[PDB]
Amino acid sequence: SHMEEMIRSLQQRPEPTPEEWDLIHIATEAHRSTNAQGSHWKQRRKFLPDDIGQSPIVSMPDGDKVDLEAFSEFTKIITPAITRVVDFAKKLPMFSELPCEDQIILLKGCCMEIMSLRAAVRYDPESDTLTLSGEMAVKREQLKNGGLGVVSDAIFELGKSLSAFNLDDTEVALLQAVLLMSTDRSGLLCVDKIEKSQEAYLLAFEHYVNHRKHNIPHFWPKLLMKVTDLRMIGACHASRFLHMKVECPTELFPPLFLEVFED
Ligand SMILES: Cc1cc(OCC(=O)O)cc(C)c1Cc1ccc(O)c(C(C)C)c1
């Protein structure tokens, strides 16, 4: 009984309004359809072979060498992963209504954040791998040695901790939306449309969490601190990406990878 829940409680936990449920369903299918979901075609997905990613040897300024071969294997699969993120965003109405200029900024802004989340939630405890591009299951050491350095460690620990959050497609979808609709970027026009779009998404997202009634204490603040986890991952990665670019030939960076991550 809703009225009793309402009286008895300390504060109120509103569930999604119809307008928000529409927002949630569009977001949920946006993410599902650009997730390399669990469909037929993606669930053909092999571990990265154990002899790859064990030979880090190209020196990076912070001392954490890079396995050239493992690196190449990851750049070889990264373009579709970046593209899927673009498709995700394009399928959100509040995104596509935005000036093209704003859209690029927003995607550059959050691409790694969304990719990292996407891997994070694909963390698998019995194998101790993340799944990259819906396809490649990799271990902590492999991804670490293959380019990402301590950014691998961060995604793994994020993925490990998210295990018990039992996120469903929606929660990951709305997390992405919150990440995407961020005004922590320079050079946007619709700084206010974007803030309002993030508010609506946060509002629908908490309201949805309310609906799910996870049996973790303080789920929503916790699920909010994960967002800053992700921004920190994105920021470490932007930094290691510049050092990736200093140390390695452009031949190894796929045009799109270069594009999403150049300043
Ligand atoms: C390759 C890759 C794919 C990926 O897929 C996310 C998804 O499922 O869409 C998610 C992550 C986190 C990575 C890893 C990655 C992410 C950024 C980056 O600069 C590098 C270089 C070492 C090639 C690797």
Numbering used by the authors: 145 to 407
Show me the paper's own sentences about this structure:
The human (h) TR exists in two isoforms, hTRα (NR1A1), and hTRβ (NR1A2). hTRα is expressed at higher levels in heart and plays a major role in regulation of heart rate, whereas TRβ is the predominant isoform that is expressed in the liver and pituitary and is involved with hepatic cholesterol metabolism and regulation of metabolic rate. Thyroid receptor (TR) activation occurs when an agonist ligand such as TH or similar compounds binds to a hydrophobic pocket in the core of its ligand-binding domain (LBD). This causes conformational changes which allow DNA bound receptors to interact with coactivators, mediating transcription.
In the second crystal form (C2 space group) Arg 228 is in another non-productive conformation (in white) which is an intermediate between two conformations of the same residue found in the first crystal form. Differential positioning of the Arg228 side chain is related to hydrogen bond with the Ser277 carbonyl group that flips the Arg228 side chain into an alternative conformation. To compensate this conformational change, a water molecule (W343) bridges the Arg228 side chain and the GC-1 carboxylate group. This weakens direct interaction with Arg228 and forces GC-1 into a new conformation which involves re-orientation of its carboxyl group. First, the GC-1 oxyacetic acid ester oxygen forms a hydrogen bond with the main chain amino group of TRα specific Ser277 residue. The Ser277 side chain hydroxyl participates in a hydrogen bond interaction with the Ile221 main chain carbonyl group, which is not available to Asn331 in hTRβ. This means that Ser277 fails to engage in a hydrogen bond contact with Arg228 analogous to that observed between Asn331 and Arg282. Thus, Arg228 is not anchored by contacts with the subtype specific residue. In the non-productive conformations GC-1 maintains the interaction with Ser277 but the strong interaction of GC-1 with Arg228 is lost, giving way to a hydrogen bond of this residue with the main carbonyl of Ser277. While hTRβ Arg282 binds to the ligand in a single conformation, hTRα Arg228 has the potential to flip away from the ligand in non-productive conformations, resulting in loss of an important interaction for the stabilization the ligand.
